[PDB]
């Protein structure tokens, strides 16, 4: 008899992360009055101040952006910023009265094989599928980057993309985005640390500002020295301007030691225009120092 | 070493179900002698006298329907009726000596993130696959509603169509419905307490009879009164008849409070046609009780 | 407070695994100077000796193989040999120092309902798909068999194909193989007892040998003899060769009992060619012997 038995379920995640997890409505106004719904998608509410992380395409050329909580109330939103690299957008509603936010954990570490359930709200019941972290994202904003993607095998489509990808704690392990192009059976999120710097910039700048150094090149036992190679150099960019030639070695950028191409890139991204950092380099067997003024990144 | 550990395993599950889950063949007679088999599906033996579920699409235009246990017995079914809507049909088995039944807990509440497995027998091995409840469904009989499947991220397939979902203990929770048309990785199944309703009716009536009133209508602090108003209203209907009106308002449904369009609309359909009920509501300010009889619903 | 708690995770079996799970390319030599990635593809570490099986497909027309490990060491790989039915080619490595080997449990009996990770290495992180096995595969080497594959909903594509499929406890149930032409949401992998098997064979001889009886037929309470009627005789096989005669009903192949037409045929496919077996019939209600030379299957 399994009368006194207990089914295996992730009902505790959904119950602790699900709250959280909102409708975004597009609506369009046609001249006729009349409100019409363009498209629908899914939202997380990140804090009680009434921050939400949907995406951008859900959010795009919208006369109207309306939000729908699974406890009854419907605000009306103020798109923040957003960024199409990532797909994200920020928005913002005014609530009285506390809001359901979702469960993070900051000292969390996501691993491979980790069970997570990526929670949708696409009508209002909900839509949730299951799956595992098939690997794990990086978190930078290097513009070239194919790695700054968590990737999973629990089904992202039109119902969930926006929402939450928790793990079986109803902790938040990333923000689900639909993929528009992969191996079969692979969706992927915004890492949740990638998600939360993202939205801290856009609620400064109103954009994701990128730094941008103008170099391409790649990397070079401990007892030999590592670097980047500069393979070629941006015209008018800073390295050109800051007198930096190919074949140069560079060894040292804002005072990191660059060992590897990937990871400087994603550090010269950070850095915000305007800025003056040395970059040190091994030319003709001898040591120079520049000066470098970082600029944006070209669209 | 892992010779002395115990695998992760929904095993007990299958034991528990599968031998429950029939094959199911669809057999027809060209005029030769010859018997070929037009298609193939899985079916769930429900009780002890021999009642089965299955797919109307795997019996439709049978000659011969043949039932095939995993233990090895054959038998000729008769079809007892089906209905289009739910894709859903019973077969009857004369059976000597015991049958395998499939377990089912009427106690038993679904709970979104439950773990279920979809089990078919395609070709008697079985087909059997993993995922979680992704929506519980509506019990409903309104043949306008889109809410009377439970979602689920298991694969359903042509292999397990027709069969049981079960959760982890083999209670089941729902027929197997493969979709001919929603969100990719979401498939489809008939909650197991609408699918024992519709087995009833079938069984007394040899088709689901649909009671029908033949009213749109949309619905309307606790101190206001909920209500449907009424939006248009169907031409030599049970309403029309009883002389319901346009911008009526219906309080009161055979003595249920109408708070829902919905609600009342799946509780019209359990009526049987020839039923006279009491239809409450306000007009002019007024109070009108008003006796209609309800009809079948219209094909 | 979640801040206490452990994640419901199979991480366990990532560690155990993934290590011995490698990126195979096959590289082609343009006549420029240059070296060009033809595809790319995972592989698994059988022993210490440094065999690994993968795709035949992935190594097709390599002018050279290249093999890299999770640990960072890149080695040059001879092909053993393949096999087009099952999709399996054997290389060998030479390593100084240890290798990382997949665990292997030959005394584990694979259950239909246990969890399962494919887990792949395409372009070394590793991708990785967790689902359960659906149905258990037979090991036979017959080519007209259908059924010696394992069946499993975890996700089997271009990322893991030719690596290893795990329980939760790392111990390898079969290798990965993706299908190239059968239900949505199922993926194969070639059982560990089967992909052993084909390993030693390719060792020894350079290719898998398959007995061929040339024999066609179908099977026939315990008190009747089981046997296998013969359908057909092929000309100048090793039956007909022999003296065998349609209507002939074989009761006993090189002393086993023939009482399966799939199991027979699987038994005479390990025998080797050249070898001269009794075959026992029944004709004319009497019982003759018969000395048959096993020959090579026709390709």
Redesign the interface.
Known sequence: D??D?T????????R?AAPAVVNVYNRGLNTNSQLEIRTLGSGVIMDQRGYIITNKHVINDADQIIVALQDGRVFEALLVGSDSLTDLAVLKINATGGLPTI?I?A??VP?????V?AIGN?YN????????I???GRIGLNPTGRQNFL?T????????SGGALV?????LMGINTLSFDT????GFAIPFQLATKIMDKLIRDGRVIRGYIGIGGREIGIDQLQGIVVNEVSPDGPAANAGIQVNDLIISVDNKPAISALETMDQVAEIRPGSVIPVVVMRDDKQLTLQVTIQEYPA
Do not use: F, K, M
Request: proline content about 8%.
């Open positions: 399994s009368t038995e089914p295996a379920s992730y009902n505790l995640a959904v602790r469960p954990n000292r969390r691993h491979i094989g980790d069970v359930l696409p019941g909900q839509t949730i599928t299951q799956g595992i098939s690997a794990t990737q095998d629990a089904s992202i489509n039109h119902g969930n793990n079986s704690l109803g902790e191996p079969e059976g692979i």
